[PDB]
Design a binder for these strands. Structure first.
Ligand SMILES: N=C(NCCCSC[C@H]1O[C@@H](n2cnc3c(NCCCc4ccccc4)ncnc32)[C@H](O)[C@@H]1O)NCC1CCCCC1
Ligand SMILES: [K+]
Ligand SMILES: [K+]
Ligand SMILES: [K+]
Length: 543
DNA sequence: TTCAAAAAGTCCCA
DNA sequence: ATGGGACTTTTTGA
């Protein structure tokens, strides 16, 4: 959880580089989750140089006895550096580190061992920097979540993250005219959960700059995707955001001595976004992509949500109790009426699904424990303890052997389209085989009233096109290197069109499906057909 | 009653 | 041992 030095230096310089120490020699710089002091120790160094280089100007303008080089260390610690953290061992270490910068009478260091989200803050701050804790909805303590939902409701609801609240706290205790700079996960820029947080930021601070590392691995051995947000409360009217979006996610961050060298390089693209034009969604793309995205949005008269019914897959609550290999001998104990075909996200390709290798025991259809005791005793019951610990079993809503969220079978046992929940690219397939799946695969079918306007074959044709792959990724939620979330909260917002190319687009899609399903697959002709279809779609959308 | 979101992902190997 | 690639469960609030 140590922040790389190149990033820490950038964040501290972002807040302090243009501070007028002559005009205000008492800046308050705060790290609200300071830890061992990665940021605060750097703040000390930047401040010490700033005072030392202007010591004679300060001595002349103010108390000439107070402003001496020998007094800089005491002045910084008494008036300038502030830190908070729940870990007292970390605070104890940081207090010694700040004390040892000088090496008389004891100096008072403004370090607080507390919950920053609970501390009564007695004053606001000129500059706030740091790296807050990230805790999601599963890993956050439930008693603590009751407090967040009560006191941080403006940014924390439902599946929100703890670091949303730190954004609220930082914004709230930032002084008028102050600057804040933090590194957090990037997901709030796009996630459904971040909607209220994005609204809070946009309407309370001026966002100066967003550094989006997309799927690059900033923290070694940490599966998180990062961004750096810099914002102020200055009296400003232009309110444009500098956006630095990484171009190559494989870049090593230490290739340059400073992060500014990386941002100005070819490894990053830069563009500006007008904060006044931000909706509840933040479309952070360059001018070419915005033009591309807007062309499609205006041209398409329908969305998938308009024409389709979407649903999440089965959630058994314990897969090992209900999912068996189709060659497992224990399936001889299970009547075939209980057995469903089961696929994973890797089984979804463009246009068609791999033949399934697993079976789901649709245990909800087992009427009672004595009629099918063999299945319960020998297959499902091997995990009875874990099954009984599921929420709906402890409450009695669900029997110990039942699927936790078995949905409705009739939704799955029909022609439908399926796609993986996380993928590098658009993979929408037509399911012909009544496949069931877990929540790693999403499904939709077409509403009856739109069947004469849209066919499954036409839909997988355009949804798998290069145009729609780029189109979806403009606003999709970037998760990790080469992985986007394909979830209904964005997939169902995809807009679709219907025009004179409909018949030829549909016909090419049928050819691709026919080739994909034959014995000797010549994958090459599929690629040529896809190129022809992409041209038709670009012709249709005028790009 | 029952939906769908959530990576400080998880796990393995060369 | 690490960094990078393949692949993705069920807990949870609403
Ligand atoms: N995913 C993670 N990553 C690691 C955090 C790294 S973040 C950097 C600094 O941040 C410091 N830090 C963290 N939280 C706060 C905070 N509010 C309390 C948050 C709510 C809470 C409730 C109950 C238990 C724990 C936490 N206020 C001030 N400092 C804080 C924290 O000590 C750390 O050195 N989990 C770890 C989780 C386990 C218990 C201790 C740390 C939290
Ligand atoms: K003087
Ligand atoms: K990453
Ligand atoms: K992990």
């Amino acid at each position: 959880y140590y922040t790389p030095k190149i990033i820490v230096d950038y964040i501290v310089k972002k807040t302090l580089k243009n501070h007028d120490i002559i005009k205000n020699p008492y800046p308050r710089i705060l790290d609200i989750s300071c830890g061992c002091g990665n940021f605060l120790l750097e703040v000390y160094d930047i401040l010490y140089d700033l005072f030392e280089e202007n010591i004679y100007e300060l001595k002349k303008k103010y108390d000439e006895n107070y402003w001496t080089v020998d007094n800089i260390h005491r002045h910084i610690l008494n008036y300038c550096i502030y830190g908070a953290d729940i870990d007292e061992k970390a605070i104890s270490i940081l207090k010694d580190s700040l004390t040892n910068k000088k090496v008389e009478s004891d100096i008072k260091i403004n370090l607080f061992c507390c919950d920053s989200l609970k501390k009564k803050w007695r004053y606001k701050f000129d500059y706030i920097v740091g790296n807050p804790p990230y805790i999601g909805h599963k890993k956050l303590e439930k008693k603590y979540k009751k407090f967040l939902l009560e006191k941080y409701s403006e940014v924390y609801k439902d599946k929100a993250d703890l670091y949303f609240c730190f954004y609220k706290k930082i914004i709230d205790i930032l002084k008028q005219g102050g600057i804040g700079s933090v590194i957090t996960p990037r997901y709030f820029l796009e996630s459904l959960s971040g909607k209220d947080l994005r609204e809070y930021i946009k309407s309370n601070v001026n966002v100066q700059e967003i550094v989006d590392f997309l799927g690059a691995n900033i923290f070694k051995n940490i599966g998180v995707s990062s961004c750096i947000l810099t914002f102020d409360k200055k009296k400003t009217k232009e309110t444009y955001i500098d956006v630095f979006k990484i171009k190559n996610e494989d870049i090593c961050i230490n290739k340059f001595e400073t992060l500014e060298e990386l941002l100005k390089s070819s490894k990053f693209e830069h563009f500006n976004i007008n904060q006044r034009l931000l909706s509840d969604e933040w479309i952070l793309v360059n001018k070419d992509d915005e033009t591309f995205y807007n062309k499609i949005q205006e041209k398409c008269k329908y969305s998938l949500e308009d024409i389709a019914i979407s649903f999440q897959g089965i959630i058994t609550g314990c897969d090992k109790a209900f999912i068996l290999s189709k060659d497992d001998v224990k399936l001889n104990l299970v009547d075939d009426k209980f057995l469903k075909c089961w696929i994973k996200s890797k089984n979804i390709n463009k246009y068609i699904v791999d033949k399934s290798e697993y079976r789901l025991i649709y245990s909800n259809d087992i009427d009672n424990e004595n009629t099918n005791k063999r299945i319960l005793d020998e297959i499902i019951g091997l995990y009875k303890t874990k099954l009984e610990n599921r929420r709906e079993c402890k409450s009695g809503i669900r029997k110990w052997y039942e699927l936790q969220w078995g949905r409705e079978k009739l939704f799955f046992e029909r022609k439908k389209i399926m796609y993986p929940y996380k993928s590098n690219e658009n993979r929408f397939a037509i399911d012909y085989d009544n496949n069931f799946s877990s929540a790693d695969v999403y499904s939709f079918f077409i509403k009856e009233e739109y069947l004469d306007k849209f066919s499954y074959e036409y839909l997988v044709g355009i949804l798998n096109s290069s145009v729609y792959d780029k189109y979806f990724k403009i606003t999709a939620k970037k998760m990790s290197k080469n992985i986007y979330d394909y979830y209904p909260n964005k997939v169902m917002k995809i807009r679709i069109f219907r025009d004179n190319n409909y018949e030829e687009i549909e016909n090419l899609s049928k050819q691709i499906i026919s080739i994909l399903l034959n014995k000797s697959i010549d994958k090459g002709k599929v690629e040529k057909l896809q190129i022809k279809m992409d041209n038709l779609i670009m012709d249709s959308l005028g790009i």
